[PDB]
Coordinates of N, CA and C in Angstrom, one line a residue:
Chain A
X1 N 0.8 -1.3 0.0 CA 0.0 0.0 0.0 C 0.8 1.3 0.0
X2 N 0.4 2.5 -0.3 CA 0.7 3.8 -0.5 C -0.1 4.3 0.9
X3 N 0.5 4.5 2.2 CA 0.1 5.2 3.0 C 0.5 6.4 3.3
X4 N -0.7 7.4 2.7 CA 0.4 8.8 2.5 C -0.2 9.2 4.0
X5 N -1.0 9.1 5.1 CA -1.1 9.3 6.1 C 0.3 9.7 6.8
X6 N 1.3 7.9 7.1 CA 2.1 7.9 7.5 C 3.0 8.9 6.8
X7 N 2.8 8.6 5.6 CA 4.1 9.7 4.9 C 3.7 11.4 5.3
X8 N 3.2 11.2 5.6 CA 2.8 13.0 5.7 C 3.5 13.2 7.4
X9 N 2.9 12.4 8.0 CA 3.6 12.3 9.6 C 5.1 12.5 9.6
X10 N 4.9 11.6 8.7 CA 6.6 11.5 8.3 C 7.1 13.5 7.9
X11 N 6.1 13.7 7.0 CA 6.8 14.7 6.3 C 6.6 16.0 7.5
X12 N 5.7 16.0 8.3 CA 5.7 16.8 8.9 C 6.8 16.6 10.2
X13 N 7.3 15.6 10.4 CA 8.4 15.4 11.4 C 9.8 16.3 11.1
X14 N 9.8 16.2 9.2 CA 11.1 16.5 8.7 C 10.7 18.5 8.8
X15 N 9.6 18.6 8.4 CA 9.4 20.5 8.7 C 9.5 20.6 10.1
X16 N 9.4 20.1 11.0 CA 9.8 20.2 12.6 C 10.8 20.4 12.7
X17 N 12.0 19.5 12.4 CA 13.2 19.9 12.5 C 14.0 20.7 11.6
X18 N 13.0 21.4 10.7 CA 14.0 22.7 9.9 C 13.8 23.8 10.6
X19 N 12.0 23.5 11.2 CA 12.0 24.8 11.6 C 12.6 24.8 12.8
X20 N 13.1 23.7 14.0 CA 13.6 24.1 15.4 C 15.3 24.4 14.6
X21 N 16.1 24.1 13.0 CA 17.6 23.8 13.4 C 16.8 25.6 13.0
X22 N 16.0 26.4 12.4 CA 16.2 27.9 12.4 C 16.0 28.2 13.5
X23 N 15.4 28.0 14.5 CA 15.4 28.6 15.9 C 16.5 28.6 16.5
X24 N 17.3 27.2 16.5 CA 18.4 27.2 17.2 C 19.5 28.7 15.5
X25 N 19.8 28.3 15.1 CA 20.5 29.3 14.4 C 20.5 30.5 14.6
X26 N 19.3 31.5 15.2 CA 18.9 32.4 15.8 C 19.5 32.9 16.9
X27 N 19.5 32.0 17.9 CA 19.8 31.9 19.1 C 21.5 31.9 19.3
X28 N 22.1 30.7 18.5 CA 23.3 30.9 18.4 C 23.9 31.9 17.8
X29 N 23.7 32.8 16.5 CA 24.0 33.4 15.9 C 23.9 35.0 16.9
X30 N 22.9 34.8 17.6 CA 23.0 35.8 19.2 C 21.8 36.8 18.4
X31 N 21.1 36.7 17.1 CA 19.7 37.7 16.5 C 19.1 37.6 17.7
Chain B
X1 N -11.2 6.5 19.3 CA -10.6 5.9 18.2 C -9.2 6.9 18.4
X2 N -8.3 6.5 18.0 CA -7.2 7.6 17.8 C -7.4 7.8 16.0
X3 N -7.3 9.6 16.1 CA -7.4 9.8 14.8 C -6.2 10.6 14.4
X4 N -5.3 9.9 13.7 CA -4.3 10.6 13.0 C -4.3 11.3 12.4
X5 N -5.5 11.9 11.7 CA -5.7 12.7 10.3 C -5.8 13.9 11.3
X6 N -6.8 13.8 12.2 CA -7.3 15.1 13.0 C -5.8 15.7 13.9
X7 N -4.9 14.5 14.4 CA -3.4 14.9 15.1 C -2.9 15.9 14.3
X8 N -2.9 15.1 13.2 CA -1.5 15.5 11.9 C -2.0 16.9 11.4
X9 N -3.7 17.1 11.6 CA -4.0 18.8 11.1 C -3.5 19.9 12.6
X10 N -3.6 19.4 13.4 CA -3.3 20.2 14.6 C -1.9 20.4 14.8
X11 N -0.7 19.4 14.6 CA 0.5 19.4 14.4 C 0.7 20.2 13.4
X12 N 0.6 20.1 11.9 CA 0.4 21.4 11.2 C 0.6 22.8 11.9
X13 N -0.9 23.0 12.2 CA -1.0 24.4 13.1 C -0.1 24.6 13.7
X14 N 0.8 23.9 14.8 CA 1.8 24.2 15.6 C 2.8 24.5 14.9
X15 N 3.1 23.6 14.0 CA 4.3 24.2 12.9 C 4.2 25.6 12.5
X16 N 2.7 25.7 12.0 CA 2.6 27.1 11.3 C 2.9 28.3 11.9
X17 N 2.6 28.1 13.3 CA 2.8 29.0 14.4 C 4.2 28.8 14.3
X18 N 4.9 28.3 14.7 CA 6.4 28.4 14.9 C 7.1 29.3 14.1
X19 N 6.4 28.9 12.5 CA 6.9 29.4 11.8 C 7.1 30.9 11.4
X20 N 5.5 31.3 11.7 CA 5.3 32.4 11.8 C 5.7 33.5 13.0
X21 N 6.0 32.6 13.8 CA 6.8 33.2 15.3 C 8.5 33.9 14.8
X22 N 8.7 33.1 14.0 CA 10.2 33.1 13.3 C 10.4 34.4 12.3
X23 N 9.2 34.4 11.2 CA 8.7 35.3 10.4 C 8.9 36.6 11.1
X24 N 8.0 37.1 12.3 CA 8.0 38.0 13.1 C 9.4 38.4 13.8
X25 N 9.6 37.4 14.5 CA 11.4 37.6 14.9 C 12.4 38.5 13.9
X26 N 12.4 37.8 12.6 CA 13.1 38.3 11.6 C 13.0 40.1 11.7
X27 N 11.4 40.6 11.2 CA 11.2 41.5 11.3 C 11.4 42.4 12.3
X28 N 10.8 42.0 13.5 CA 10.7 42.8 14.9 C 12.7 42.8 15.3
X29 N 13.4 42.1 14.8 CA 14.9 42.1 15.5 C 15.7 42.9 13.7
X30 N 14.9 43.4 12.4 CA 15.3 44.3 11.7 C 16.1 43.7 10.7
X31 N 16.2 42.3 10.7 CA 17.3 41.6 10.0 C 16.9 41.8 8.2
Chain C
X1 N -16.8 15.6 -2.4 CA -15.9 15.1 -1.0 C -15.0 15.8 -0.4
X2 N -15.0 16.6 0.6 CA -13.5 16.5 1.6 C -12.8 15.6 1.6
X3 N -11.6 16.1 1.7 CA -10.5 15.0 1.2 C -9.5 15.8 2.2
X4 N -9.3 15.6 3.6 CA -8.4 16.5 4.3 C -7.5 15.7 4.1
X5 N -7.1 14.6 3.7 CA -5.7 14.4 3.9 C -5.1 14.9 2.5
X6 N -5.7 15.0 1.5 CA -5.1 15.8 0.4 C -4.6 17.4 1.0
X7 N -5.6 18.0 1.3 CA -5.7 19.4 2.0 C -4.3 19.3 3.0
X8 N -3.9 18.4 3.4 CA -3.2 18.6 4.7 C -1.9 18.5 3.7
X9 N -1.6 17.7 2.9 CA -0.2 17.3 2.2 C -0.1 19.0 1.3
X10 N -1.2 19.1 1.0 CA -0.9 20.3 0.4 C -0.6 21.9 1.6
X11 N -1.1 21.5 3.0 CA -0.9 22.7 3.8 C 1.2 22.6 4.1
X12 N 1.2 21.4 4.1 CA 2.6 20.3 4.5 C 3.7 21.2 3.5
X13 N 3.1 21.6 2.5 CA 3.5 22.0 1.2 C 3.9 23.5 1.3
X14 N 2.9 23.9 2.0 CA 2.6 25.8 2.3 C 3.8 25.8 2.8
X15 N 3.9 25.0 4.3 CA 4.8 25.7 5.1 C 5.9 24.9 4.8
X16 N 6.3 24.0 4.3 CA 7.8 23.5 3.6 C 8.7 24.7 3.0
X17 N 7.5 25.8 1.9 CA 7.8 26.9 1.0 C 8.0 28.2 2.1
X18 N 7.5 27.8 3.1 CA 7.6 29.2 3.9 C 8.8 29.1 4.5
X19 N 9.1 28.0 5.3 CA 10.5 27.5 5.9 C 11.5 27.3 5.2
X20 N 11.4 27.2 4.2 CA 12.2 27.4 3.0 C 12.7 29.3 2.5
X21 N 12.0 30.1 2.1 CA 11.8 31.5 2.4 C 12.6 32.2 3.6
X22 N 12.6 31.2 4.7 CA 13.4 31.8 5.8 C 14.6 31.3 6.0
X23 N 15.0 30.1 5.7 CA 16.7 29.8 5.1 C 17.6 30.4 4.5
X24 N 16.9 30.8 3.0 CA 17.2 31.6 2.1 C 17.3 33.3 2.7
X25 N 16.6 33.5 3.5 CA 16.4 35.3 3.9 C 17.7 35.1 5.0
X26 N 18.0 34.4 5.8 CA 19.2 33.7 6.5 C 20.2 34.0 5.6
X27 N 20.0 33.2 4.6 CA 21.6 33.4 3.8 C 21.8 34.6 2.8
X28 N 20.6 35.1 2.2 CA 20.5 36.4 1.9 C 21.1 37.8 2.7
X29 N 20.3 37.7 3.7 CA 21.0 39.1 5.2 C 22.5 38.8 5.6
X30 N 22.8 37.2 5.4 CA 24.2 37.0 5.5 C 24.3 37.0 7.4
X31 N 23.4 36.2 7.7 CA 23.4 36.1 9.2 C 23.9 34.8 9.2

């Protein structure tokens, strides 16, 4: 099967962690 | 029932907020 | 039909492009 449910879970895992590595980049960068 | 469809739209929204938290940052800190 | 899980891969999509937008303005400002 093609379970795009899980794939989407999936996909939304991988935008979680771009948007926390820009927060940290923020913070370290001292903006 | 656990509904993943209904999780994965509310996870969304969290994201979107983040993101938009970030959006704002940019601006409000003049970068 | 509603079709939220289409809707959602496509919201998945929104903010991919928007998180994306703020990488780029990252390496644009040269922060």
């Amino acid at each position: 099967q093609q379970h795009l449910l899980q794939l989407t879970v999936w996909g939304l895992k991988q935008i979680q962690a771009r948007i926390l590595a820009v927060e940290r980049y923020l913070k370290d960068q001292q903006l």
